[PDB]
């Protein structure tokens, strides 16, 4: 129901988002993502199941010059990157994850240990064991990265990729067969719905059959729960003070004594009643939101809370609260993601085909080209540089950006316009 997570971030993940508040907002939304995904999924153990974070560790670019940090090396394989996180003592947490901004080869985004219901080790519910080769590793770990083929992945795919590797932690292998991978089915009704979470390959934007688990995944996770969550999972209750996120019942949350660099917040090591509470005379804390400074004051007007995006106009701070003002959209149907998708009401989803009443399709060196189609007929599937759509595009052939799914989600397209499986 509630499993106390421990999330880490390296300096590559901190450097991309460019303050500690930005990365904290990313890891806060990732936990709540898999919280909602797993709660709305019916598991055999109990009807619901959520997550909770117990502590965080935000490594900044100042830690790149730290000789004791093994994550400072820019070139680190995805297997050795997970092995580094395992070698730590994580017995106070059910699971422990580390988020990075590395471009792993062959389109690898996440990597986690498979959870065995019994007779093995790894995944969910595993304490540090001695094993072999003498290093005490904690196999209750997993990694994620937000860049693929030189392109940063959107948060929707980034939130799902968390839920995918956590599925292996919960004891779910990859989906197999037609009954649990409708994307490769010879039926238009099942193919439109798409594959599931535990699909072994690339996924992005279908949002119906891909966001939640499968009938196959529920069976495999059912055994791990019915035998391991009894001795592994903990209770639901009020949110803890010190996890770096501002929950209900607390006005601020900077962390513990050795983490809190906030002059506006009592750390988690302070006595009850003042821990995670605003210090007297102070009216905010950077842990609440990005719209307030270290001098504990609601930020002044005309300051960038949110920058102008493709489909989202800039949100601009002022002194009404500590949060961004919710961002609002610019003119509708503008081109986003380098002429690949459209801007309708604040989202860069779908494809560019929907701008003229068309749908994306798989071409049939041309796989990384955008192949549109007349609605509901895949036989009318022609390229953007075809003579069919010559009236609209005037001929310019829109190519898929690197890191985009291709050939019915069998791989990604690289910087050389090759659909690598």
């Amino acid at each position, epitope marked *: 129901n509630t499993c106390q997570l421990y999330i880490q971030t390296d300096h590559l993940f901190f450097k991309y988002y460019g303050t500690r508040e930005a990365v904290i907002a990313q890891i806060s939304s990732h936990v709540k993502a898999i919280d909602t995904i797993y709660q709305t999924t019916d598991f055999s153990g109990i009807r619901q199941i959520s997550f909770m974070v117990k502590r965080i560790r935000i490594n900044t670019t100042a830690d790149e010059k730290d000789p004791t940090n093994p994550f400072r090396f820019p070139n680190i394989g995805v297997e050795k990157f997970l092995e580094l996180n395992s070698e730590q003592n994580h017995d106070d947490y059910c699971l422990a994850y580390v988020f990075t901004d590395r471009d792993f080869d062959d389109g690898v985004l996440g990597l986690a240990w498979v959870g065995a219901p019994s007779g093995s080790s790894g995944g969910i519910c595993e304490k540090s064991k001695l094993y072999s080769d003498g290093k005490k590793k904690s196999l209750n770990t997993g990694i994620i990265t937000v860049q693929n083929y030189g392109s940063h992945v959107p948060p929707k795919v980034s939130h799902i990729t968390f839920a995918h590797e956590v599925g292996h932690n919960f004891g779910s292998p990859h989906d197999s067969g037609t009954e649990c991978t409708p994307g490769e089915s010879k039926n238009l009704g099942q193919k439109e719905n798409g594959n599931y979470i535990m699909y072994a390959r690339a996924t992005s934007g279908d949002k119906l059959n891909n966001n939640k688990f499968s009938l196959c995944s529920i069976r495999q996770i059912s055994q791990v729960l019915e035998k391991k969550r009894n001795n592994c999972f903990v209770e639901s209750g009020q949110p803890i003070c010190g996890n770096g996120m501002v929950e209900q019942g607390e006005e601020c949350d900077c962390g513990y004594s050795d983490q809190c660099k906030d002059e506006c917040c009592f*750390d988690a090591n302070q006595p009850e009643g003042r821990k995670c509470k605003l210090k007297p005379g102070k009216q905010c804390s950077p842990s609440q939101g990005p719209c307030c400074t270290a001098q504990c004051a609601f930020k002044s007007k005309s300051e960038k809370c949110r920058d102008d995006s493709d489909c989202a106009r800039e949100g601009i701070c002022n002194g009404f609260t500590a949060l961004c003002p919710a961002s609002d959209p610019k003119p509708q149907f503008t081109d986003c993601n380098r002429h690949t998708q459209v801007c309708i009401n604040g989202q860069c989803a779908g494809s560019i085909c929907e701008k003229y009443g068309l749908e994306e399709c798989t071409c049939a060196k041309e796989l990384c080209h955008v192949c549109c189609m007349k609605k509901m007929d895949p036989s009318t599937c022609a390229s953007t540089g075809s003579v069919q759509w010559s009236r609209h595009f005037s001929g310019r052939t829109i190519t898929l950006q690197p890191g985009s799914p291709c050939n019915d989600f069998r791989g990604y397209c690289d910087v050389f316009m090759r659909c690598r499986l």
Partner: antibody, heavy 117, light 109 residues
Framework: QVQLKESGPGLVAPSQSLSITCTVS????????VNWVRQPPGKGLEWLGV???????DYNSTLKSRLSISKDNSKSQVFLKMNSLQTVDTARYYC???????????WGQGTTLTVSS | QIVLTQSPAIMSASLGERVTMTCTVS???????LHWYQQKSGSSPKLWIY???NLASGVPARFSGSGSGTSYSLTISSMGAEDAATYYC?????????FGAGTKLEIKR
């Protein structure tokens, strides 16, 4: 157990500096705040300032010009410094721990301060 | 600036009588942050009631505290010979830290 003991000069002349040492015991100054409360002869409790476990300070509005509060976490000592002491600064200066929900659960014996020429 | 008005500022009571003190704050504070203290002549104050309704370690059961929002109370069920002192209410939920005016509880003869 928890102890607090303030070390003051006792008798100072007006227009002179002040320095009181609040030696504490039983707890760590990193997880508890320490308030300074003076009490004039025949009057009520009067707040001076406070230094938090993380090193942050909050002072009395009319005394921030002269008051100054620092501490030493390793030696369990909180320091109270004042400038341009007037004759009306004669009082008994206490230091008390800021406990759960800001309760002043443990007080010191207090040190008498007399300001007269 | 939060003010803590304490009334009655002067109380006379005989042995066995029942007294009730009051503190009215200028702005509503959470109940968990108001505390009462007892101070005798020539001695430092002692935490008496903490978190409004919780008696400190050692103070007798004849004491009690109630209140919420703006009004707060301190009640002695049976006035004893040892309860003649001055009582204060305390708040530091909001700056600055302020004490009450102080209630002088004198025993009546």
């Amino acid at each position: 157990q928890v102890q607090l003991k303030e070390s003051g000069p006792g008798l100072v002349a007006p227009s002179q500096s002040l320095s009181i040492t609040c030696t504490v015991s039983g707890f760590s100054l990193t997880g508890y705040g320490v308030n300074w409360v003076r009490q004039p002869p025949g009057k009520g409790l009067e707040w001076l300032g406070v230094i938090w476990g993380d090193g942050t300070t909050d002072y009395n509005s009319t005394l921030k010009s002269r008051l100054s509060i620092s501490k030493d976490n390793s030696k369990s000592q909180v320091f109270l410094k004042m400038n341009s002491l007037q004759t009306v600064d004669t009082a008994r200066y206490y230091c008390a721990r800021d406990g759960d929900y800001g309760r002043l659960d443990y007080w010191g014996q207090g040190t008498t301060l007399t300001v007269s020429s | 600036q939060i003010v803590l008005t304490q009334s009655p500022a002067i109380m006379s009571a005989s042995l066995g009588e029942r007294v009730t003190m009051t503190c009215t704050v200028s702005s509503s504070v959470s109940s968990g942050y108001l505390h009462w203290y007892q101070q005798k002549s020539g001695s430092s104050p002692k935490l008496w009631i903490y978190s409004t309704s919780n008696l400190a370690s050692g103070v007798p059961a004849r004491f009690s505290g109630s209140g919420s929002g703006t009004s707060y109370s301190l009640t002695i069920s049976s006035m004893g010979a040892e309860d003649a002192a001055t009582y204060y209410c305390h708040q530091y939920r909001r700056s600055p830290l302020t004490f009450g005016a102080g209630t002088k509880l004198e025993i009546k003869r």
